[PDB]
Design an enzyme around this catalytic site. Sequence first.
Site, PDB file in Angstrom:
ATOM      1  N   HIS A  13      12.426  24.628  39.121  1.00  0.00           N
ATOM      2  CA  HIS A  13      11.335  23.701  38.804  1.00  0.00           C
ATOM      3  C   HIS A  13      11.219  22.602  39.863  1.00  0.00           C
ATOM      4  O   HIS A  13      10.149  22.033  40.053  1.00  0.00           O
ATOM      5  CB  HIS A  13      11.428  23.123  37.374  1.00  0.00           C
TER       6      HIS A  13
ATOM      7  N   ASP B  93      15.705  28.725  35.336  1.00  0.00           N
ATOM      8  CA  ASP B  93      15.402  27.574  36.150  1.00  0.00           C
ATOM      9  C   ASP B  93      16.545  27.493  37.128  1.00  0.00           C
ATOM     10  O   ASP B  93      17.521  26.768  36.915  1.00  0.00           O
ATOM     11  CB  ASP B  93      15.285  26.344  35.252  1.00  0.00           C
TER      12      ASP B  93
HETATM   13  C1  LIG Z   1       9.648  10.029  29.155  1.00  0.00           C
HETATM   14  O1  LIG Z   1      10.934   9.946  29.778  1.00  0.00           O
HETATM   15  C2  LIG Z   1      11.528  11.021  30.401  1.00  0.00           C
HETATM   16  N1  LIG Z   1      11.811  10.961  31.722  1.00  0.00           N
HETATM   17  C3  LIG Z   1      12.392  12.004  32.336  1.00  0.00           C
HETATM   18  C4  LIG Z   1      12.702  13.191  31.650  1.00  0.00           C
HETATM   19  C5  LIG Z   1      13.395  14.313  32.366  1.00  0.00           C
HETATM   20  N2  LIG Z   1      14.684  14.504  32.002  1.00  0.00           N
HETATM   21  C6  LIG Z   1      15.480  15.435  32.575  1.00  0.00           C
HETATM   22  C7  LIG Z   1      16.885  15.590  32.070  1.00  0.00           C
HETATM   23  O2  LIG Z   1      17.713  16.170  32.760  1.00  0.00           O
HETATM   24  N3  LIG Z   1      17.102  15.121  30.830  1.00  0.00           N
HETATM   25  C8  LIG Z   1      18.218  15.167  30.090  1.00  0.00           C
HETATM   26  N4  LIG Z   1      19.344  15.737  30.514  1.00  0.00           N
HETATM   27  N5  LIG Z   1      18.175  14.649  28.943  1.00  0.00           N
HETATM   28  C9  LIG Z   1      14.953  16.225  33.585  1.00  0.00           C
HETATM   29  N6  LIG Z   1      15.676  17.189  34.209  1.00  0.00           N
HETATM   30  N7  LIG Z   1      13.673  16.034  33.967  1.00  0.00           N
HETATM   31  C10 LIG Z   1      12.888  15.097  33.405  1.00  0.00           C
HETATM   32  N8  LIG Z   1      11.567  15.082  33.859  1.00  0.00           N
HETATM   33  C11 LIG Z   1      11.295  15.232  35.294  1.00  0.00           C
HETATM   34  C12 LIG Z   1       9.855  14.828  35.655  1.00  0.00           C
HETATM   35  C13 LIG Z   1       8.827  15.929  35.388  1.00  0.00           C
HETATM   36  C14 LIG Z   1       8.396  15.973  33.925  1.00  0.00           C
HETATM   37  C15 LIG Z   1       9.586  16.300  33.031  1.00  0.00           C
HETATM   38  C16 LIG Z   1      10.499  15.087  32.830  1.00  0.00           C
HETATM   39  C17 LIG Z   1      12.420  13.221  30.295  1.00  0.00           C
HETATM   40  N9  LIG Z   1      11.838  12.149  29.707  1.00  0.00           N
END
Ligand SMILES: COc1ncc(-c2nc(C(=O)NC(=N)N)c(N)nc2N2CCCCCC2)cn1
Length: 245
Positions: free
Chosen positions: A46, A97
């Site tokens: 991703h 992924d």
């Molecule tokens: C609203 O706030 C928020 N900000 C970031 C993410 C997010 N989190 C992860 C992740 O690894 N999360 C985890 N281990 N709990 C991860 N690998 N990628 C993330 N994102 C990356 C941007 C693209 C959109 C998806 C969110 C989720 N929520």
Amino acid sequence: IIGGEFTTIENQPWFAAIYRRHRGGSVTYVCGGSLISPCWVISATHCFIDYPKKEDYIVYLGRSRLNSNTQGEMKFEVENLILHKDYSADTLAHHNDIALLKIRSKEGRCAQPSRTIQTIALPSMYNDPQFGTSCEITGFGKEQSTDYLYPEQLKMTVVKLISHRECQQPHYYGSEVTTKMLCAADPQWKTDSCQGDSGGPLVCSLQGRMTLTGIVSWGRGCALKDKPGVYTRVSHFLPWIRSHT
Ligand SMILES: COc1ncc(-c2nc(C(=O)NC(=N)N)c(N)nc2N2CCCCCC2)cn1
């Protein structure tokens, strides 16, 4: 990484840092990775799908800092970018992924192992640790979900593994989690992976040696109650890995 502690590359020398060129000279951080072999770093897919051209990307090793050149580091261009054919993005989930990057420098050489640069071993097939196993995540990801910025210094923390049966709960991720994915979390939901940690490692010690058990993949909010981190279950992708090398 949410919470946890800061570290240097000497504690996690397999860790890799992936940046993308612009598009007008700028070089921004994309994702983490793990050097599994001298010429091969492994990441998440991703991370690259929007701009899936290898010439965009730079990979550094022996680097403990984000926008500052760490002493003893090595910089690499992506000779080949290999995304997983059956990849798919669910609204939350990311299926298969997993990405492989072949690295070589401007002088056309792979890595040389040093104090700050060393490979991580892969599991034997399907051979995952007992759930509740404490395991190690690393990356320059957000320190808190509200943050704009990623930390300048590398971070790492501990998370305990969660049985599939457990993670399958509707209370947790319901259907979204599959058996090619692992879950992990802190029992208090106190520390976690976050955005920017993606592609970075999940290293459990297994059979008295450190082992790359997972690749940081997805989650709903970094460190929230009943929402673990989700990681690619590496034991499940060994033939794909093996072949594509
Ligand atoms: C609203 O706030 C928020 N900000 C970031 C993410 C997010 N989190 C992860 C992740 O690894 N999360 C985890 N281990 N709990 C991860 N690998 N990628 C993330 N994102 C990356 C941007 C693209 C959109 C998806 C969110 C989720 N929520």
